[PDB]
Amino acid sequence: STTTNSNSIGRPNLVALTRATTKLIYSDIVATQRTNQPVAAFYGIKYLNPDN
Amino acid sequence: STTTNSNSIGRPNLVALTRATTKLIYSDIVATQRTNQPVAAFYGIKYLNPDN
Incomplete structure (x- = not known):
């Protein structure tokens, strides 16, 4: 009675x-813009009351 | 070993x-209609019972 144990497996399949x-x-959490110099400058321009 | 500290950065990029x-x-909170004279008059017209 030749069972499976008489057989020998070969190379198992990589499923x-x-x-x-x-x-x-990080694309959605922050806002991005490429810089063409190693130092980047962001401008903060404010509108003030006569009491600044 | 000419490091980057020898280079001097130029104008920083305004990103x-x-x-x-x-x-x-203020356009959506209140109703607006332009006035053509330095005094504006809004009519108030009411319907009353025989007891006013």
């Missing part, structure tokens, strides 16, 4: 990979 | 402006 990565959230 | 203004709400 599926599994990478793990976080849901990266 | 973005920033002004502060409230969400001005």
Whole structure:
């Protein structure tokens, strides 16, 4: 009675990979703009009462 | 080893402006109709009972 144990398995099948990565959230949390110099300048222009 | 400290940065890049203004709400809160004379008169017309 030749069962399966008489047989010998070969190369098991690689069914599926599994990478793990976080849901990266930085495009929506912050506002971005590319800078063409190593130092960036953001302008704060304010409207003041006569008491500043 | 000519590091980056030898280089001198030039004009910093003005990435973005920033002004502060409230969400001005006076067109939607109150009813507006332009007046053509330095005194405006709004009529008040009422319907009364025989007891006023």
